[PDB]
Structure 1
Amino acid sequence: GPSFPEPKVVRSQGGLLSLKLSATPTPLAIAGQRATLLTYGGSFPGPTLRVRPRDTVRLTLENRLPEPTNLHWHGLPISPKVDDPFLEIPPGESWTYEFTVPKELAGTFWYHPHLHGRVAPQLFAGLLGALVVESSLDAIPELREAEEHLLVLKDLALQGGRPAPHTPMDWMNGKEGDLVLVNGALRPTLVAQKATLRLRLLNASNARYYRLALQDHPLYLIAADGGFLEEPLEVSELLLAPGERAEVLVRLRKEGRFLLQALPYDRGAMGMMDMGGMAHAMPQGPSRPETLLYLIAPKNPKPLPLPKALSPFPTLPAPVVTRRLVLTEDMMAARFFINGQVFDHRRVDLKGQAQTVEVWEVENQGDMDHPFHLHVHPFQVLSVGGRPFPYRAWKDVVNLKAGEVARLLVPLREKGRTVFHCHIVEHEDRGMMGVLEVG
């Protein structure tokens, strides 16, 4: 097949994407070995769904797992009666998700389980896939003529031909694997045919971070989690926390081989040490560097000019309330809290008003990085750690290092009951989640 593996794409037809997926244990070949993973549609990653604004999506999920499951349409501003974080599909049963893609929407989104207490093992085992919303902006020459690829960044560990089980330390840290894969492949080669690449990036890992850097090249950020930036932003590296997405343009500068790497990054994961009676927690330190793929540039590359503008960011109404959400940890108990509480599906934690704007101040008072995710209502990051954000774009995950405060502008869209949580999904399963009701 093609040198660069990417998930199979399913496109809407005549305004309708109608599809049956099964969640199923699936034998397959992965990184040169045979393993049984949990997949959607028989593949790892699951199929990429590619739609346009105002399309109808009709997705029937059949549960062929031994435990209940559901779907979270991560990043999609739709109703929480569709993107329902409390729904359980029992083993053997099916459920049809039907929604209309919002008119003002573009970017890379994804789907994965969200059944509280079971997310981390199900996602680690392989249950995830991407959803791409095409834009009329994709027709401007500087994007249309680029070579486009999706990169699903997800790691894995195998034991006895199956995903490795979670240990107690995994529930504390979030589980990372030794197989650091791109689209389920081990260090694939991308032989570029054009000098400009448009790369859609998705961190679908449980807990691993990707401090992205391409050898000898900057990256040009053109989209965040849930939409385009207003104009391209040149960066020397790009950190992608669990659940985040980004789109970048790569402008290949000369012939040759360039490594795309995940550079060392210390997210605050912990180990245990005994040095003379004391048996106490100790920082794991930064991750070891990983090569994600080999990028081969074509002959005499002459990249396209960058687009001068992308999409103007909406002017938001003035906000009507400020919220403060504080994250804390009990590492040795593997318990995680928001404003001193663990998740309770019966307890509403915040009550807001549809079509108003709120300011959310999220403060990480723990020692680990925590990537904070809000369902249903995309937000604008104003600042993190007291530093103003260098662009305007819709996001739905924001990473917080130890001590940092994020100030978010949160327009409330669809009415109903939804959730916010850490997207180190082990921390969500262990309690770091709360309930927002919009009325």
Structure 2
Amino acid sequence: ERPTLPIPDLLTTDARNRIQLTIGAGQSTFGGKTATTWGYNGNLLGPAVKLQRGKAVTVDIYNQLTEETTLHWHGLEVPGEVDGGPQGIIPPGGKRSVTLNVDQPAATCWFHPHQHGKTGRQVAMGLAGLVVIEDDEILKLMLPKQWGIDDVPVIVQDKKFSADGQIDYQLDVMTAAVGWFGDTLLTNGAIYPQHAAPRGWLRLRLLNGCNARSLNFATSDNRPLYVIASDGGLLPEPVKVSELPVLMGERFEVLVEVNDNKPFDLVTLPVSQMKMAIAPFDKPHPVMRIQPIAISASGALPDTLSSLPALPSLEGLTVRKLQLSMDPMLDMMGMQMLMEKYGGGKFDFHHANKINGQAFDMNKPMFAAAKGQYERWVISGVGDMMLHPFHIHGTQFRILSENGKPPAAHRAGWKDTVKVEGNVSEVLVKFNHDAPKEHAYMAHCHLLEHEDTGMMLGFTV
């Protein structure tokens, strides 16, 4: 009765150097009840696009939805033209082709809609896919690499459903304040699936694909997780942890030992968002069952994985300050609402959340950043106690200060997201590619309902 963990197709180019992605609506079943869902190349979620560093691929994108959408390639160091800006809106029945030039270390990135004001809803409906970047360096390590066997993507997402089974998503005052949270946890679209893993090392490419919920991975029997990669790729050495917090939109790759016939679970532990943990995420929650099989796998975990460049001197680097702000009444409303779950004048919430006192204006980039030079961006969330995972397009950056303190070792490598939660973060960013006004990059909170209600800025390079 325990469903098998679905494995996204790992797609490579055809003989024409092309990959096709179709965006469309279908049906899925959750807990025995059908729901209308959206997917790439299917009814729900999407495939994993395989890229090779230093090689070009062209992606043909067909929008079969009845509304506009866009595609954001989260974590890719690509020109702003790839996401597209206004030219990046794909009308119903429209086609968009993008040629991806992959010039960054091996990493697990992802892709998802980014229509402003509607990103939360389109992700909630089902749209997300993966990007697997490979390079020469990672292949020489002889990591677990049999996709779907000992090298497995694990996209973890919550959803809220109505009584009839349909996805229950509404961007209203309360969801704009706190985010969209559900009580049903999905793993590659399935409820508590199991994966059969050969003996030895099992590699999990973890993605927190929730709109607003932070996760904290561990195992049911407290066996450790060996973190080998963050958002932007390999760490210099594996970092062993007993638990692994993962913010919305973040990825980590971990190895876990499969050493006998005893099944065990990947779980997620309670997280305080504000300072409340709400059922059914107020105690450890299963994510998926790992079922050992008698076959042994040959993946290895070397002592050294990669090399990170030394941080440059901070003297002389441009400093950019970004102040996140939540509307005080959304902030208050959200605190009271969570306190109860845990236990007029013309206001428009669609532009109520802000950066540097401005809600996102698609026609006015806030600044231009330098191309090819390190900058220090300082992001403050001092006005409220909510979690804002801050994401910057076009770069894999280094965290200098995460929410007031130097980053943990497994978060000190390549990142595209930094925690901001009532304190101040500082990141060292470099943009290798152009993004003109008509194809501007974005920087924003990745709690999707916050960015949909104004907590985003555009910038050019």
What TM-score results when the alignment is normalised by the length of structure 1? 0.89
Say which SS state the counterpart of residue 249 (structure 1) adopts: strand
Query: Relative to total residues, which structure has the larger helix share, 1 or 2?
Result: 2
Say which SS state the counterpart of residue 332 (structure 1) adopts: helix
1:399 matched residue in structure 2: 419
State the percentage of identical aligned residues: 34
1:12-411 correspondence to structure 2 within 5 Å: 12-13=13-14, 17-86=17-86, 87-102=88-103, 104-136=104-136, 137-144=138-145, 147-159=150-162, 160-166=164-170, 167-215=172-220, 216-268=222-274, 287-289=281-283, 290-298=285-293, 306-319=301-314, 320-330=317-327, 332-333=329-330, 334=349, 335-365=352-382, 366-389=384-407, 390-391=409-410, 392-401=412-421, 403-411=422-430
Shift in Å at residue 227 of structure 1?
1.1
Shift in Å at residue 59 of structure 1?
1.6
**1:45-67 deviation per Cα after TM superposition (whole angstroms, max 9, x unaligned):** 21111221123222222222222
1:3 matched residue in structure 2: 4
Shift in Å at residue 348 of structure 1?
2.2
1:419 matched residue in structure 2: 442
Say which SS state the counterpart of residue 81 (structure 1) adopts: helix
**1:100-145 deviation per Cα after TM superposition (whole angstroms, max 9, x unaligned):** 211x321111111111111111110001111111233134234458
Give, in whole Å, the separation in 2 of the partners of 1:109 and 1:357.
Answer: 22
Distance 1:305 1:20, change over 3 A: closer
**1:167-213 deviation per Cα after TM superposition (whole angstroms, max 9, x unaligned):** 43222211122220110111011222122111111111111221111
What TM-score results when the alignment is normalised by the length of structure 2? 0.85
Moved more, 50-59 or 204-213: 50-59
Conserved? CA contact 1:21–1:40, under 8 Å: yes
Conserved? CA contact 2:3–2:190, under 8 Å: no
Say which SS state the counterpart of residue 121 (structure 1) adopts: helix
Give, in whole Å, the separation in 2 of the partners of 1:399 and 1:51.
Answer: 28
Give, in whole Å, the separation in 1 of the partners of 2:189 and 2:262.
Answer: 25
Moved more, 372-381 or 255-264: 255-264
Shift in Å at residue 284 of structure 1?
6.5
Q: Residue type matched to 2:430 in 1?
A: P
Give, in whole Å, the separation in 2 of the partners of 1:109 and 1:162.
Answer: 29
Shift in Å at residue 304 of structure 1?
6.7
Shift in Å at residue 43 of structure 1?
3.3
Give, in whole Å, the separation in 1 of the partners of 2:11 and 2:142.
Answer: 25
Provide structure 2 residue ranges, at least 5 long, that are not aligned to the other structure: 331-348
Corresponding pairs, count = 422
Distance 1:397 1:68, change over 3 A: same
Distance 1:23 1:300, change over 3 A: closer
Conserved? CA contact 2:199–2:260, under 8 Å: no
Give, in whole Å, the separation in 2 of the partners of 1:304 and 1:39.
Answer: 32
Q: Residue type matched to 1:404 in 2?
A: N
